[PDB]
Structures are given as structure tokens and as C-alpha cells.
Structure 1
């Protein structure tokens, strides 16, 4: 009777058709456009979008003017406004189902780093996050699948320990300085 968690779930799903032309072309287009690593990421984004769509459909099939419908509908709309995939104009339950994988993919931290101008390419943004150069609200982030909120967009800048934004220079700078000192004598 040890005291552990024993709670876990799978965050992605595998399609029943492994070899189709249009599906593989679409996921390859998404991966090459937004600089992702493998198809497990877009599969997990499809999984969470399917979960959100299923929840919205389950709320829509329940009758109007009920407290549970209003509570979970307004909770879902406030949540998706807080992510930033919707605006206050389209604050409706039926407008949830007209979403796309694109709207969930624009809120990635890698996409925001490439879009604001910190990086030159989306893959350069990914490897720039991986070497701990990007911080937000005084906390460094080393992971590319970070979902930034709407209020957290304007806090994106370089870190206080990265040499790009002011700090100690890296390994190649000090080694080349020591090489220049050795060459100069």
C-alpha cells in the first residue's frame, strides 16, 4: 500500500489510416511550416482540439437556459479567450466548432519568438529556446511547446543570463579571446 500517484493518460491519438497521400501531405506541410519535430505533436494538438470540440458539442446538445450549460460554456469561452485563439466578438458556443489546428498552432512560444522578431527562422527560434535565451515575466523558458496567454505577449524579451540580451559571453567568445591572447603573446 505505497503512497504514489498511479494517474496518467495519453495525450495523442494515432489515425486508423496509416498511408494516405493527402493526410501525410497535410501534416508534412504543418510540420515544415511551423518547424516541429515529429507528427506526435500535431497528433496531440488534434487530440486536444477534438476534446474541446467534443465538450462544446456536448454542451450544445443540452437545452438552453440551464445553469450547467451556461457555466461550462462561459468557462470554456473565458479559457479560450485567455489562450488567445478567440476574440470577444466571437464569444459564442457555436463559434467554438469553427476553429482550426492553425489557431491552436499560432499560440506556440516558438511561433511568437519567430513572429515578434527575436529569431530569423522558426527552427532558429526552436534552437534558440533550447539553449535558454528567451525569458518571460522574469523566468527563463527552455521548451518550445509553451502556450503564452494574451496578457503574456508583451513581456517577451531576451534573458539576463543569455549573452544575446546582455550578460556573460559564451564558450566560443572566451576561447577565441584566449586564442587571440596566445597569438598576440
Structure 2
């Protein structure tokens, strides 16, 4: 007997066919376009979308005025609107099945800091975030997979203690300044 918790999950599922040529080209295109590290980072978002589509398909088989359909349908739709994947004027349970992986991949902090002009590429954004140069609402974040909530889009800035903001220069400029 211990005061410990053993609850955990796996966040991805592997594909059934390991060497499907059409799927290998489709997934590398996403990796290259959004600057991902490995195929496991595509199967994670794809798993999350697969679980969202499965809840919607189960709610869509209930009565249109089923009390559980109107409670957990509104919650799912509101959750999808909040992060910016679904539109404000499309809060219908049939528009969830029209969602794509690219919608979910566009809300990553890595994509957003690049699309806001902080970084010169999608690979510069990765290192900028991992090197503690970016903050969201006074909090320093160094997780590139941080999903940006809609009313956080305006509060992504350079960190207050970084050479790219008002901070001191890094070790290299300091060392070369004393070189002469």
C-alpha cells in the first residue's frame, strides 16, 4: 500500500501497415511543412483528432433533444472554438467531421511565433521557443507543442530577459566584446 497513482495513457497509435508508400509521402509533407521532429509527432495529433471524431459520431446517434447530446455537444463545440480550430459561426455537430489535421497543427506555438514574424522560418521558431526566448502572457514557455488558445494570440512576445528583448546579451557577445 502506497500513496501513489498509476493512471497514465499512451498518446498515439502506430499505423497498421508500416511501409505504405502513399502514407509515407503524406506524413513527411506535414513534418516538413510544420517543422516537426519525428513521425510520432504526427500520430499524436492524428490520435487526438481520431478521438474527437469518435465522440461526435457517438453523439450523432442520439436523439436531437437528448439531454446528454445537448450538454456534451455544446462542451465539445465550445472547446473546439476556444482553441481556434473550429469557426464561431459553425457550431454544429456535423461540422466536426469536416475538421483536418492541418487545422490542429496550425495552432502550435511553433507555427504561431513564425506566422507572427518573430522567427524567420519554421525551424528558427523551434529553436527560439526551446531556447527560452518566447513568453505568452508574462509566462515563459519552451514547449513547441503548446496549443495556443484563441484569446492568447495577442500575448505572444519575446521574453523580458532575453537578448532579443530588453535583456542582457548572451555569453558570446559579452566574451567577444572583451576580446578587442
* Shared fold per TM-score greater than 0.5: yes
Which residue pairs with 2:103 in the alignment?
103
SS at match of 2:132: coil
Deviation, 1:62, is 1.1
Normalised by the size of structure 2, how large is the TM-score?
Answer: 0.98
Deviation of 1:110 (Å): 0.4
Alignment of 1:144-183 (within 5 A): 144-179=144-179
Unaligned runs of 5+ in 2: none
Rounded Cα–Cα distance in structure 2 between residues aligned with 1:64 and 1:81: 21
Aligned-pair CA distance for 1:178? 1.3
TM-score (norm: length of structure 1): 0.96
What is the alpha-carbon root mean square deviation over aligned residues? Answer: 0.8
Q: Structure 1: state its 5+ residue gaps.
A: 180-184
Give how far 1:99 is off. Answer: 0.5
CA distance in 2, matches of 1:123, 1:148: 18
Q: Larger C-alpha radius of gyration, 1 or 2?
A: 1
Report Cα offsets for 1:89-121 as digits up to 9, x if no partner: 111000000100000000000000110100000
1:7 to partner: Cα distance: 0.6
Name the count of aligned residue pairs.
Answer: 180
Residue 151 of structure 1, CA deviation: 0.3
The answer for the alignment partner of 1:54 in structure 2 is 54
Distance in 2 (CA, whole Å) between partners of 1:8 and 1:148 is: 24
C-alpha distance after superposition, 1:20-69 (max 9, x if no partner): 11100000000001000001111011101000000000000111111100
CA–CA distance in 2 between the matches of 1:8 and 1:62? Answer: 30
Superposed structure 1 runs of 4+ greater than 4 Å apart: none
